[PDB]
Write a protein that binds this DNA or RNA. Structure first.
Lengths: 249, 705, 511
RNA sequence: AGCAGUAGCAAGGAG
RNA sequence: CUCCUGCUUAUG
C-alpha cells in the first residue's frame, strides 16, 4: 500500500504551478546540484555561534507531541523546559535533554546498537585484550606508505562496495551486470538472508555493510611490521623519539 | 636584572627552539573596508613589470591590448623584476627536459590525463570552494552558481541533456555563439542581455581581501573566478597534476622528506677530489604577477603535440580566457568633509567622474590604469592571480632546475609553488659566482624572479622549505594552527569525538609528542564542558542543568558510566583516541540509563558517532525579513523535490544518480515498474491499481499542461 | 566524440591572444610541433649574465650584521586592556548558589564597601575628569539599587559613543553646492614610538610566584595503563603544578572570566549598557574564593560582522602611585585608604575608555590554549635529550640540567643566569601569553624576519660560512615592520643583546 | 573620546 | 545644530 501513498504525494506536488517547471526540466544527475543550495557562505565560526546558542534560555528545536506525551512543563524550581512560540515544533532548553536522560521512558534496544556498530566494538574488544611493556627511547622514522588499517576478512577495493550495496538492498535500479558478480553473488545470497527483515533503515544498512568489507587504506607514516591489526594503534606504538612494543600475541 | 627569552639557542639547535618564534596563539590579521587599492596595486604593478609599450588594438573588446611576450625594452635595472618571457628559450628547456626521462613522456602523461577526462561527470565541479555568480554578481557556493548558470542555459535556448564535462564545455562555447542570453533578476523578473556583454561577463574575476593570513605586514588581494573558467582549469590541473606526479624533483602532492634525503645523499655521492656543495634557500617574490598565460599557451601547445584532436583544442582555452580577464575593482572609496561628519560613498562605477576627490597615491595608481578600465572592471592580460593554475608553474620550476649548459660544475634542487632549495656543486667561489649568476640568469630569462633579500646558503644541509627547517641531522615539524582543535560546534555528541579525531590526525601527521596530546585533550575537554554547561557530579556547580543531575544522581548505580555530556568524568586517554566516548562507556551503564539515553523515540533527534544527543539549533530572524525570502522559498522547493525523489528511489544517497532523461519521468516509469512487479506477486486489486494508475495519468496530464 | 565545438567568437579570441611574432594559432601550433633546440641558447644566457652587476656577500670578511634601529622617540605606553602588575583585589569566600556575575557584583557591593569610595572631582592627571566622576557616581548608585542598566544621561552619551558616527550617504542624491562641503579623503598611517623600559619588570613579575594557589580551571586526570601514560601524566602533573601559582595564571583567569562575561553579555543584550565585574576565582587555604579587580561597562554593541569595535569603560583598583609615562592613557583619581597587614596605605582608582571586538573576544576567551606550545617545547628538549642518550633518564634530567636565561643590566658579556628547566617553563608560559595578547601585524612580520636571523645565528654556531645577496633591503623590511608594538620593540632590543652574547664567541657580528 | 592601521567601526531617519 | 524610534536572564 506504499504505492498509493507515494502516488498521493506525487499527485499532491504536481498541484503546485511553479514546481512543475522544476522537475521534468532538470536531469537525473542534477539531484546532486539539487541537494546543495546552501546559500550561507561558510558558517565560519561554528563554536562561537554554538556558545552564543547555548547561552540563551531556549536554543533547541524539539518535537511537541512526544514531549507532551511524557515530559513535564517545569521542573521543581523554576527550570523552564517549554515554549508556546512557533509546523508544530517547539523550542526548549537542554535541561529537557538531561531530564529526558534521567526521568524518561526506556525501550530495550541494546541488540540493535550492538549490531550496527560491530566495527567499533570490534576495535574495543581488540583494544582491551592487549598487553604493553617498556619504552625504548631511540631514534625512529620511515617514509609514507599506503596502508589498509582495519582487520577485515573480505578486502574489497571500494568499487564492489557501492556495486555490492546496489545488488543487496535494492536491485530494481541497481547497475549493469558486470563479470564481478558471480562469486560475490554467492555472497549476495549470503547477505539477503541477513538484511531481509530488520528494523534497520536502508541508509543505516548501507552504512553498516561498508565498514565490515572495506579495509581503510590511507597514506600514513609507518614503521616496523605493517600488519593491519596494529595500524589503528599507529599513534600509540611510537612517535619520533620514543617507541613502545611488547605484544606477545 | 634583565631577561631575554632567546638565549636558549646558545646551546640548542633550531629544531627545538623554533616553535617558540611563531605568533600562532594571537589574533590573525583582518582587513577592513574596501579592497580597491590592493587590486589597483596588483594591476598597475603587473603593467609596470611588463617592460614594454607595444600595444595591439582589439576588435572584440573596446579596450587596448598590451603584449607580454618577446617584446622587451631592456632597462639597466635588470635586478628589478621583469614579466617578459622568451618562448624559444623555455621551449628549448622543454626539449631539454623531455630528453632527460623517456622519449614519449608528454604523450604518456597526456594520454593518462585524457583517460581521466573522459570518465568525469560534471558534478565534480561542485566539489570546490566559492565562485562568482554573474547573475546576481555575487560570491556564491559552487552548486548555486552552477545551478544559476544551467538555469540561464535551460531558460535561454533549449534544455540541457549533457551530463558530461565535454558537452558542458561545448554548451559554454555555444553560449558564446548565442546572440542573446536571458536570465532572471530581482519579485523574480526575467531579463535579457546582448552578445558582447555576455563575453565581458563570462571573463570576469572577482577580487577580495585575503583575511587571516599569518605572515605579512601588508595586505594582499585574492581573486576568485567565475563558473565558465572552472572546468577548463580542472582539465589543466588534471594534466599538470599527472605531470607533477610523474616528475621526481617536485613536492606538491605528497613525500617531501625522502626526496631531499635521496638527492642530498645521491648528489653527495657525485663529488670529485676538489668539488663541494652549497645550498641556497630562496623565496621567489612577485610570483603572481610574473607568470603570463601566453607562455602557458605555448607550452600547453607543446605538451599535447601528439595526443588527440580533442585534447589539443581542449587544453588551449583556459590560457585564452586568462589572456583577456577582467578584474572587479572592489567597491570604491569614501569621501568626507573638513569636519569629518558627512561621508559619501563612491563605488567603482563613478570613479572616473569623481576623479578629483582622491589622494596622491590613489591618483598615481589611477592614472597608470586609466587606458585599461571598463565601466566597473579592469582589463588584465598577463596576470596569474591566486586560485588558479598551481601545479603548472612548478613544472617551470623543474624546467629551470633541469638546465644543461654543455669544469663539471652544476646544480639541482627542489621546487614548490614559490619556494625552492637549490644545491650547487663547484670547485671555487668565483666559479660559485659564475654558476649562481647563471641560475639567476636562466630564471630571469624564463620569467622567474628570485628575491635577493630572502635568500641565503651554507655548505651542508641547513636550509628551509615550506617552513620545515632541516638542520644537519634532524627535522623540525610544521607549526600547526591551534583553532583546528575546536571548529565542530554542532552537537553535544559530535564535538569531543571530533576533537579526539583531530588530535589523532595531528599526532600521526605532525610530531605532537604525547603529553602535549594529553594536555590538548584535557583543554578541549574543558572547553566542551564550559561551552555546553555540563560539569561533573562531584563538582560544586549549581546551574539549571546541574540541579537535575545533582538531584537524580541517587538513581544511577554505577557512577563512572555516565556520559561527559551528562556529568561524567573523563575515560578516554591517549591510547583510546580512536574509540568514541559512548562505545567505550556502554559496558558499564545502568540499563535504565542506557535504555533511556538510546531511545530512538525522543523529542529531539526525531522530526561519525552515535546519534543520541543530536539536536538542531533554531534558525535566525533576519533571514525572512529582507528581500531574499523567496530564496529560502526556492531551497524549500528543492528540499521538497529531493525528499520526493528520495522517497521514490530507496537507495539514492549511496550511488550517484546518473542519467539524462528527466526526474519525474523516472518517477512515473519507476512507479509503473514496481506497480507491475509488486502487482503480479503481491497486490492484485482493481480499485488500488486503477486508482494509482488514475493518479499517475492525472498527474501526468497536470504536469504536461 | 573527438570533436570540440568549433565556435565563432572563441576562434577570433584565441588567434588574437598569441605572442607578437605570430599571426594565428595555426602558425604557432605548426611551429611548436616542429621545434628543435639550438646552441644559441647559451649566448642568450651569457648575454644575460654580462648585464647583471650582482655580487654575493660573505660573512667572515664583511660581517655587517649591525644591530637594529630602535626608534629614539617618545616611550611606548601601556596599551594592554587591563592592568597586570598594579592590580588590587577584594576577597570573600564564594557562594555556590550566588555565582552569576551580577550576583558576584552585588555581593561585592556589600563585601567591598563602596560607601567609602569617595572621589575628588579633580584628578591627578589625564584628560576628562567630570565625565568620569559623574560616571563613577552613577554606576555606584546603580550597583547600589541592584540593577545593571544605566539610564540615559550625558555622561554615558559622551563616553560610550552614541550619535558619534558619520552619515553614510549613497551616490544617488548629492545636492552639489558651489565651494561648499568640499569633500575628499586622506590617509596617514601609524604613529611611531620608543623603547619601553617597564616591560622587563612586568616580565619578571609575570613569572614570580604569588598566598592564593590554583588559578586556572583545568580538568580531571584520565586513568592510565602501564604504558607511557605514566610519562604523560607525570609531565602534565609537574608542569601543571608549576603553572598554577604564577601571576600569568591570574591574568589568564581574569581574561577568561571577564571576557566570557562580557561576551555572553554581548550576545544577550545589544543596545543596552551593562555593568560587568572584572574578577577571578582561586583557592585560599583550601577555601574556594573569588576576587574583584575592577568594573567594566559595555557600550551598546551591535555586532554585525566580525568587526564592530564596541566601547568598554574600565574602572580599576590600584595601590601604587601613577606615572605619566607608562600609565599615560589613564585618568588616575584617588579612592581612599586600604588596611594592608604585613600599615594603612592609599588606594587609587584608574579610569580608561577602550574597545574590544567580536573577533578579539574568542581569541581572548579561549586563552587557556597557551599551555600547548610550552609543553611541546619542553618535551622536545627532554625527548631530544633521552633520544640522544638512549636511556630512560627523565626524572633526574628535570633536576640536574641548566638553561641560560636573563643576563643582567650593567654587563652582558658571558654573564648569564642558569635556571632549572621548570623555571624555563615558567618563562615559556609568560612569553606565549605575551604573544597571546600583543599579536598585531607588526609582531607577525617581525617573527618572520627573526626566523631569518635565527637561521644566521645557527649557521654561525657551527662554522658554515653563510652568505647573503643583499643586506640593504633586508634591514629595510625589518626596520619597516617596527613602529609601535611594545613586544616587537622589546624583542628587537633583546635580539640585539642576543647578538652581543653570541658575538662574545662566534665571529659574524658587531658591538 | 576611543579601538584600529594604509580603512573602516563607533544607531537610523528628516530639516 | 534641532527633532522622532526596540524584545532576547546569561551560572568553569
Amino acid at each position: 500500500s506504499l504505492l498509493l501513498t507515494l502516488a498521493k504525494e506525487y499527485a499532491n506536488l504536481t498541484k503546485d504551478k511553479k514546481s512543475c517547471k522544476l522537475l521534468s526540466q532538470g536531469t537525473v544527475s542534477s539531484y546532486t546540484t539539487f541537494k546543495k543550495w546552501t546559500t550561507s557562505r561558510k558558517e565560519k565560526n561554528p563554536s562561537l555561534r554554538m556558545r552564543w546558542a547555548m547561552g540563551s534560555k531556549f536554543p533547541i528545536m524539539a518535537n511537541r507531541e512526544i514531549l507532551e506525551e511524557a515530559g513535564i512543563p517545569e521542573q521543581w524550581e523554576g527550570i523552564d523546559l517549554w515554549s508556546k512560540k512557533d509546523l508544530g515544533m517547539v523550542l526548549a532548553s537542554p535541561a529537557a535533554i538531561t531530564y529526558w536522560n534521567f526521568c524518561g521512558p526506556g525501550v530495550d534496544n541494546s541488540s540493535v546498537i550492538k549490531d550496527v556498530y560491530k566495527a567499533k566494538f570490534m576495535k574495543k574488544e581488540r583494544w582491551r585484550e592487549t598487553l604493553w611493556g617498556p619504552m625504548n627511547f631511540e631514534l625512529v622514522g620511515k617514509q609514507r606508505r599506503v596502508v589498509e588499517t582495519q582487520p577485515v576478512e573480505i578486502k574489497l577495493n571500494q568499487k564492489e562496495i557501492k556495486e555490492l550495496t546496489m545488488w543487496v538492498l535494492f536491485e530494481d535500479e541497481a547497475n549493469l551486470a558486470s563479470k564481478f558478480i558471480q562469486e560475490n553473488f554467492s555472497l549476495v545470497l549470503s547477505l539477503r538472508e541477513l538484511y531481509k527483515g530488520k528494523a534497520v533503515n536502508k541508509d543505516v544498512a548501507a552504512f553498516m555493510i561498508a565498514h565490515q568489507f572495506s579495509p581503510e587504506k590511507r597514506f600514513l607514516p609507518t614503521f616496523g611490521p605493517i600488519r593491519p591489526e596494529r595500524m589503528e594503534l599507529l599513534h600509540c606504538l611510537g612517535g619520533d623519539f620514543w617507541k613502545i612494543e611488547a605484544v606477545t600475541a | 636584572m634583565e631577561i631575554n627569552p632567546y638565549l636558549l639557542m646558545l646551546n640548542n639547535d633550531i629544531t627545538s627552539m623554533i616553535s617558540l618564534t611563531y605568533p600562532y596563539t594571537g589574533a590573525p590579521p583582518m582587513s577592513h573596508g574596501t579592497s580597491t587599492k590592493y587590486s589597483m596595486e596588483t594591476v598597475s604593478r603587473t603593467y609596470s613589470y611588463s617592460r614594454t609599450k607595444k600595444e595591439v588594438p582589439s576588435g572584440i573588446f573596446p579596450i587596448e591590448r598590451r603584449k607580454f611576450c618577446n617584446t622587451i625594452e631592456d632597462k639597466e635595472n635588470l635586478e628589478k623584476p621583469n614579466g617578459n618571457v622568451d618562448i624559444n628559450f623555455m621551449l628549448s628547456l622543454a626539449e631539454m627536459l623531455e630528453e632527460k626521462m623517456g622519449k614519449g613522456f608528454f604523450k604518456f602523461c597526456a594520454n593518462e590525463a585524457e583517460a581521466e577526462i573522459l570518465k568525469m561527470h560534471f558534478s565534480k565541479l561542485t566539489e570546490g570552494r566559492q565562485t562568482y555568480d554573474w547573475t546576481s554578481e555575487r560570491n556564491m557556493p559552487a552548486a548555486t552558481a552552477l545551478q544559476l548558470t544551467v538555469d540561464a542555459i535551460q531558460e535561454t535556448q533549449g534544455t540541457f541533456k549533457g551530463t558530461t564535462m565535454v558537452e558542458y564545455c561545448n554548451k559554454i562555447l555555444e553560449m558564446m555563439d548565442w546572440p542573446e542570453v536571458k536570465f532572471k533578476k530581482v519579485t523574480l523578473m526575467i531579463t535579457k542581455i546582448g552578445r558582447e556583454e555576455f563575453i565581458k561577463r563570462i571573463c570576469t574575476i572577482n577580487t577580495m581581501a585575503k583575511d587571516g593570513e599569518r605572515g605579512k605586514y601588508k595586505r594582499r588581494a585574492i581573486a576568485t573566478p567565475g563558473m565558465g573558467i572552472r572546468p577548463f582549469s580542472k582539465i589543466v590541473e588534471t594534466l599538470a597534476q599527472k605531470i607533477c606526479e610523474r616528475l621526481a624533483e617536485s613536492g606538491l602532492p605528497v613525500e617531501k622528506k625522502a626526496k631531499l634525503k635521496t638527492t642530498v645523499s645521491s648528489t653527495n655521492s657525485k663529488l670529485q677530489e676538489g668539488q663541494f656543495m652549497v645550498n641556497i634557500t630562496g623565496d621567489n617574490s612577485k610570483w603572481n604577477e610574473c607568470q603570463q598565460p601566453e607562455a602557458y599557451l605555448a607550452m600547453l601547445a607543446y605538451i599535447t603535440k601528439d595526443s588527440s584532436n580533442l585534447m589539443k583544442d581542449l587544453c588551449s582555452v583556459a590560457p585564452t580566457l586568462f589572456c583577456n580577464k577582467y578584474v572587479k575593482m572592489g567597491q570604491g572609496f569614501r569621501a568626507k568633509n573638513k569636519r569629518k561628519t558627512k561621508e559619501i560613498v563612491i563605488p567603482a562605477k563613478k570613479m572616473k567622474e569623481r576623479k578629483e576627490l582622491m589622494n596622491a597615491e590613489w591618483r598615481d595608481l589611477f592614472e597608470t590604469i586609466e587606458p585599461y578600465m571598463d565601466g566597473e572592471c579592469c582589463f588584465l592580460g598577463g596576470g596569474m592571480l591566486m586560485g588558479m593554475f598551481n601545479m603548472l608553474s612548478t613544472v617551470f620550476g623543474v624546467m629551470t632546475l633541469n638546465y644543461r649548459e654543455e669544469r663539471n660544475c652544476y646544480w639541482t634542487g627542489l621546487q614548490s609553488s614559490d619556494d625552492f632549495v637549490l644545491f650547487c656543486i663547484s670547485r671555487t667561489w668565483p666559479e660559485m659566482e659564475m654558476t649562481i649568476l647563471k641560475f639567476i640568469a636562466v630564471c630571469k630569462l624564463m620569467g622567474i624572479n628570485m628575491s635577493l633579500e630572502k635568500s641565503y646558503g651554507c655548505l651542508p644541509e641547513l636550509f628551509e622549505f615550506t617552513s620545515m627547517f632541516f638542520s644537519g641531522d634532524f627535522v623540525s615539524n610544521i607549526a600547526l594552527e591551534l583553532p583546528a582543535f575546536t571548529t565542530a560546534g554542532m552537537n553535544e555528541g559530535t564535538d569531543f569525538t571530533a576533537a579526539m579525531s583531530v588530535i589523532r590526525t595531528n599526532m600521526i601527521n605532525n610530531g605532537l609528542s604525547p603529553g602535549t596530546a594529553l594536555m590538548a585533550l584535557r583543554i578541549c575537554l574543558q572547553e566542551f564542558r564550559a561551552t555546553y554547561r555540563v560539569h561533573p557530579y562531584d563538582s560544586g556547580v549549581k546551574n539549571h542543568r546541574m540541579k537535575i543531575i545533582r538531584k537524580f544522581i541517587e538513581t544511577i548505580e554505577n557512577k563512572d558510566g555516565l556520559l561527559i555530556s551528562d556529568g561524567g568524568k573523563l575515560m578516554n586517554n591517549i591510547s583510546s583516541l580512536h574509540i568514541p566516548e559512548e562505545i567505550l562507556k556502554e559496558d558499564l551503564m545502568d540499563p535504565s540509563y542506557r535504555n533511556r539515553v538510546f531511545n530512538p523515540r525522543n523529542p529531539f533527534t526525531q522530526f561519525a558517532v552515535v546519534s543520541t544527543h543530536s539536536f538542531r539549533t533554531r534558525s535566525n530572524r533576519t533571514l525572512l525579513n529582507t528581500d531574499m525570502r523567496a530564496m529560502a522559498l526556492e531551497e524549500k522547493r528543492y528540499q521538497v523535490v529531493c525528499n520526493m525523489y528520495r522517497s521514490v528511489f530507496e537507495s539514492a544517497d549511496v550511488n550517484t544518480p546518473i542519467g539524462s532523461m528527466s526526474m519525474g519521468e523516472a518517477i512515473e516509469a519507476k512507479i509503473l515498474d514496481r506497480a507491475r512487479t509488486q502487482f503480479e506477486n503481491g497486490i492484485i486489486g482493481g480499485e488500488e491499481y486503477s486508482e494509482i494508475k488514475r493518479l499517475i495519468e492525472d498527474a501526468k496530464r497536470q504536469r504536461l499542461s | 566524440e573527438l570533436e570540440m565545438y568549433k565556435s565563432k567568437l572563441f576562434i577570433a579570441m584565441r588567434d588574437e591572444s598569441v605572442p607578437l611574432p605570430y599571426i594565428n594559432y595555426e602558425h604557432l601550433r605548426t611551429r611548436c610541433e616542429t621545434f628543435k633546440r639550438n646552441q644559441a641558447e647559451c649566448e642568450a644566457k651569457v648575454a644575460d649574465v654580462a648585464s647583471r652587476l650582482k655580487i654575493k656577500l660573505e660573512h667572515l670578511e664583511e660581517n655587517k650584521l649591525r644591530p637594529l634601529e630602535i626608534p629614539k622617540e617618545k616611550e611606548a605606553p601601556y596599551t594592554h586592556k587591563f592592568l597586570m602588575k598594579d592590580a588590587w583585589f577584594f576577597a570573600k569566600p564564594h557562594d555556590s548558589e550566588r555565582a552569576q556575575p551580577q550576583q558576584i557584583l552585588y555581593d561585592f557591593f556589600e563585601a567591598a564597601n563602596m560607601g567609602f569610595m569617595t572621589t575628588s572631582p579633580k584628578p591627578i592627571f589625564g584628560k576628562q575628569g567630570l565625565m568620569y566622576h559623574s560616571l563613577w557616581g552613577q554606576t555606584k548608585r546603580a550597583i547600589k539599587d541592584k540593577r545593571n542598566e544605566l539610564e540615559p544621561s550625558e555622561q554615558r552619551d559622551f563616553l560610550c559613543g552614541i550619535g558619534r558616527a558619520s552619515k553614510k550617504i549613497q551616490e544617488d542624491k548629492w545636492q552639489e553646492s558651489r565651494e561648499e562641503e568640499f569633500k575628499q579623503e586622506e590617509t596617514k598611517g601609524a604613529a611611531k614610538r620608543g623603547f619601553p623600559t617597564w616591560f622587563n619588570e612586568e616580565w619578571l613579575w609575570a613569572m614570580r610566584d604569588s598566598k592564593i594557589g590554583d588559578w586556572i580551571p583545568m580538568a580531571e586526570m584520565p586513568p592510565c595503563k602501564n604504558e607511557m601514560e605514566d610519562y604523560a601524566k607525570k609531565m602534565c602533573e609537574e608542569l601543571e603544578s608549576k603553572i598554577q601559582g604564577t601571576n600569568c595564571a591570574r591574568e589568564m583567569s581574569k581574561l577568561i572570566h571577564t571576557i566570557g562575561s562580557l561576551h555572553t553579555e554581548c550576545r544577550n543584550f545589544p543596545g543596552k549598557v551593562k555593568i560587568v565585574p572584572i574578577y577571578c576565582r582561586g583557592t585560599l587555604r583550601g577555601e574556594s574564593t573569588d576576587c574583584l579587580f575592577g568594573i567594566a561597562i559595555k557600550g551598546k554593541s551591535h555586532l554585525n560582522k566580525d568587526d564592530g569595535m564596541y566601547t568598554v569603560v574600565t574602572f580599576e583598583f590600584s595601590t601604587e602611585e601613577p606615572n605619566p609615562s607608562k600609565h599615560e592613557k589613564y585618568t588616575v583619581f584617588e579612592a581612599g585608604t586600604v588596611p594592608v597587614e604585613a600599615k594603612e596605605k592609599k588606594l587609587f582608582l584608574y579610569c580608561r575608555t577602550t574597545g574590544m571586538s567580536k573577533l578579539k573576544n574568542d581569541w581572548f576567551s579561549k586563552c587557556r590554549r597557551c599551555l600547548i606550545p610550552t609543553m611541546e617545547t619542553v618535551e622536545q628538549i627532554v625527548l631530544k635529550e633521552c633520544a640522544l642518550k638512549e636511556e630512560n633518564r627523565v626524572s633526574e634530567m628535570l633536576e640536574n640540567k641548566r638553561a641560560w636565561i636573563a643576563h643582567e643590566n650593567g654587563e652582558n658579556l658571558t654573564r648569564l643566569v642558569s635556571t632549572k628547566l621548570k623555571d624555563l617553563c615558567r618563562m615559556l608560559i609568560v612569553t606565549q601569553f605575551y604573544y597571546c595578547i600583543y599579536n598585531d601585524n607588526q609582531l607577525e612580520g617581525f617573527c618572520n624576519e627573526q626566523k631569518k636571523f635565527l637561521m644566521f645565528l645557527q649557521a654561525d654556531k657551527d662554522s658554515k660560512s653563510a652568505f647573503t645577496f643583499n643586506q640593504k633591503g633586508l634591514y629595510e623590511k625589518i626596520e619597516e615592520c617596527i613602529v609601535s608594538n611594545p613586544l616587537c620593540i622589546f624583542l628587537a632590543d633583546r635580539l640585539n643583546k642576543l647578538f652581543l652574547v653570541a658575538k662574545s664567541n662566534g665571529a659574524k657580528y658587531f658591538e
